[PDB]
Write a protein that binds this DNA or RNA. Sequence first.
RNA 1: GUACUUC
Lengths: 114, 89, 64, 438, 57, 286, 69, 101, 49
Amino acid sequence: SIPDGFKKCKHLKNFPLNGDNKQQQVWLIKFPSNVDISKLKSLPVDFESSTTMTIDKHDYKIMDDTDNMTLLVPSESKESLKIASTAPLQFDKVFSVSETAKIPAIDYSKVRVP
Amino acid sequence: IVMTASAAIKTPQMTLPIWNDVSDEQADTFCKSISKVLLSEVIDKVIVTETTGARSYVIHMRFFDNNEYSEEYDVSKEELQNVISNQFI
Amino acid sequence: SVVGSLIFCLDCGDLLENPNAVLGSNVECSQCKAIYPKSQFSNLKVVTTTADDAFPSSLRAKKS
Amino acid sequence: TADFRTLERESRFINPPKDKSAFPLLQEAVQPHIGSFNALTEGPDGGLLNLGVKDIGEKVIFDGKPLNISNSGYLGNKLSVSVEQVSIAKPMSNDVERKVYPSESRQRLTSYRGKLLLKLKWSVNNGEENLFEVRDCGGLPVMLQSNRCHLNKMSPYELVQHKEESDEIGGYFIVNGIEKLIRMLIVQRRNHPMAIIRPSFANRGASYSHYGIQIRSVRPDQTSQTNVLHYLNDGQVTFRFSWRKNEYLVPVVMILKALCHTSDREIFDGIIGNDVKDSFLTDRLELLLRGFKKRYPHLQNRTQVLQYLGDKFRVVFQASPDQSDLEVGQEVLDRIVLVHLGKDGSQDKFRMLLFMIRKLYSLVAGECSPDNPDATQHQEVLLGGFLYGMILKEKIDEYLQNIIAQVRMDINRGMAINFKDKRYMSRVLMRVNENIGS
Amino acid sequence: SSRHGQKGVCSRKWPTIDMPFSETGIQPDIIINPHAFPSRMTIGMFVESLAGKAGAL
Amino acid sequence: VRKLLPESWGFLCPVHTPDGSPCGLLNHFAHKCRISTQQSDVSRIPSILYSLGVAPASHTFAAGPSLCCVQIDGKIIGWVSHEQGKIIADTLRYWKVEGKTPGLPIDLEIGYVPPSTRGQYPGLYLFGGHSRMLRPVRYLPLDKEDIVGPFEQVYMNIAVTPQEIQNNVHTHVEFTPTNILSILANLTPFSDFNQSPRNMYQCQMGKQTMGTPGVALCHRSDNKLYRLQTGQTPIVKANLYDDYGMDNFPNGFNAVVAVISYTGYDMDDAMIINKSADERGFGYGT
Amino acid sequence: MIVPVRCFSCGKVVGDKWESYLNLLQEDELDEGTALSRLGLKRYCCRRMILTHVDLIEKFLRYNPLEKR
Amino acid sequence: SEIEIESVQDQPSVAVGSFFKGFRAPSDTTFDLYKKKEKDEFVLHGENERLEYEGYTDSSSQASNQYVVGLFNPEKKSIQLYKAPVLVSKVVSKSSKNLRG
Amino acid sequence: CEFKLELAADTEKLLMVNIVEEICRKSIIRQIPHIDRCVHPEPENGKRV
RNA sequence: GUACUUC
Ligand SMILES: [Zn+2]
Ligand SMILES: [Zn+2]
């Protein structure tokens, strides 16, 4: 019982995993705390990263990265975790959402004075 | 020269006159023959794949082509092989 | 895993010594004894290449 | 067409403004000096000197009296001492208290001298009781336009009434009736690895290369120590330390894996790992770790590594005798290696130190141009007042060294009754020097 | 010395008894040699003498 | 170390320097340059950094010049892709100059470095601790006051005056190009119409005059002093002579200069004075 | 400091038009050109002589050790 | 390609752990995970014959960062947002309890 | 030019590019005493040197 | 002894 924290785990959830030999794979992204994890209902998926989300703040860009880290799969409750392995389990293209604020640019009308 | 007890200097210099029958197209031949060239300046890249399985080593030393190293630094197999077999090793 | 000419261990989270400097077909860890090895590591090969930095010459300047 | 001022100039010559003075740029010209000496009072944690004596360390010593194998093992009781609070408030004088003026200070041919109060947190037997005591340490010389002098928030018209300048600048000491100014000091970059190629490392280094990269940490009270990394042609790499007049060469491993638990692939993983194609990483990393296993094969965990550090460095910082290797080891460590991370900085200390040594490998692999020790790329400016505060923090512990030396000197001649008496605290507090102002 | 870099030492104190006077009446109190400009190149004193002339005219 | 470097542009005055042995040793700060004398307690630089899209420090596991290592003062937070560093190199500029950001101080050091030309280890530098130097500069997009330090002008280019500014290859502009000069040099009229050997030769002259030290004579007890009485303010002067209240401290006077070889008693290094001027008290001091 | 009377080069009596020049700038609104010339100053050296004065005596008088404050 | 979200939750059960590169994953012993509830902080530990797990979740800065995970099939083409608390761990051993007086 | 060498198990790890670079900058094709480079300059005042 | 300045 190290450390002396609040409360151990008691609730679990089952993940439907088939393990197909086109292939059901995981999807992880990166996002800050001030996000729309509850009020967002749609997110466009695209090719090599060039896109932008449209919400109240309206400055976003979904970045991708190709090039590790093990993920436990809670198949049941009494153990609350397992080891994901097919033959462990690697990944292909991790997602990391960024906030590309549009920089106001190119006003060459008042700075260039005779 | 005056006070430091002149000895082997950084850049030694000597001037050599020449006859009137020799030409500039023949002087550069003696320039290449007398000018000492480093043995490492005839290698493109030094790739070696160190193996283990009893240490084992293989050395593959890429060189230039005949028109490059033999026409530029006037060396050939009878001197390059003798120095790589008697001095380098 | 196996990378280069060195193999690591996961049951204790460290690396092991040279299988040639010590007795062969049976090597141990440094902080705790484990059943090891399987005597089937690999055929150890590695490649090193000079970056062509300290080789100056007149023809090295003409190749640019 | 910048016409000069005659009416405005005549008005400011007749009477200075009762409100904030004009041309505030002259007042902003000494913002480095004024802000430097004023920084040790404002801000959180009482300022620089207060957080300095907060993170100053606690020191103890024993006595020659027994209590009553384990009985003879225990050699004497425990007395504790540490500098708790230090504060300069305001200059004053007497035969109630009266206020002094700087104009009268240099007219008296003396220095502007306030007073320094020191609060000692004296303890005993791991805090069983605390003999509270406050003793002054003389007067501290203060310049003008500071938090101590009364010229901080005084109107310029009142400055004229105080026999001062209408646009007084201040920020300079006065001693023995003559003025004086502390010269600004030049240092290099703080908390940034600096690449340097210098043949001086080959003179003090027996058959060592000319490569080098340095780190100058910084404590919250701005006191620091220099930690540099050399380069070894054999394949290894070593730090060098800086003590009173001593240099300590030390391999990277015995102090890299000694802060907290990091002995695993996280080291090789912290190394560049996007590709394992180039073997200039493999030959150097294998030779480095092999150079750590060949020396002491029975050193595998940070616990035993910290035991060996505390063992070899037991009597270097005068940390004895109850502070075992597990205490003196972590104490001298957190004070010696990139102290700018502060306490509990071992979470990413290996990540910052690995980034330092990995920039060394990037410096020797031939893709990073060396910097310059004189260029403005790494030009830092110590404003003098900060150096004055660092000298205060440094030269305050000498009182602590003199009282522990007084206790261990009185225990030699015996006749040292129990230190639980206030009059014994006084008879031992008067033997130690207290004049810091001089 | 002025703010332009040129310096000078007072050689001999001489009154207006023999110094060149102007048609207006003003007497030049100080006199500098024109033989320093070829090398010292203090033309700032030239442009500031014209500017100073207008700035006081 | 005696010689200077172009990186000293607008940080330390390349004009104020004595002659002889102290050449290149001592040279005071710039005209309007600032010095941060306190750490602004932010505790939000990472709170907006990794929120912008920067990966954490415990889950990056990389190195090398292929990743921009973002470095806060002392503490590190990790490295990201070089394209991220490029966007952040200007994103942090916009959020810095914008006043609606409570978690970003105005006196914040921000630097960017490309990886080409085998330069030093790239990344994204962030500083602002003690012993840090600033200087004012104008930002063209939504033109507003800004400040930079000893690392900004290293890589990103600046414009000295709004006449060499051109398209998409500049980020900052300078208000008055005389701010690089010192107090003695900027007070010197037409310092551009002279020589540098004259600027070093005059730096000691202006720093060796016999002006008024301050109106405290009857209440000072220092060893030695000097005082003039014909203190006059120069007709020609910069706006800093008034901005610094230098009129309160008259150091010299104004006299009619007659460029003529009539005296004969002087040769390119000597001088001659009017006896009548000495009768009036030409530079009379005690 | 003090008003330099009898300009070294010109020699005119100039220590008298000081308070008059101040009054012209106080309650007459005349600019430097026609007012400084109205005083009776026509030569170049006497133009700059009065115009350049700084009258630092006001700063030299704000400190009197023979009077309370 | 716009896509929707179906599954949400309030209490997490999955976790991503970072030990090092190249873990053979023996998967022969279950390690326990202790939780909390500030917010977004967890911990886990484990024991073996030569291995002991020890993992925390960015105690310095974790409350201002969150990771999610999902799944998608060619027929579904949609993801499900699931709270995945990230955790960094360090494999520890036992060679302690030795000291010189 | 490719040649292969063998070695026992007494030494485990060595440097290849370093020990070869040293010998590469220490072998000389022909040793002419106390001279390494010659230049044919331009003749000054008609005196070819 | 330490610092500062003159061509
Ligand atoms: Zn093992
Ligand atoms: Zn006149």
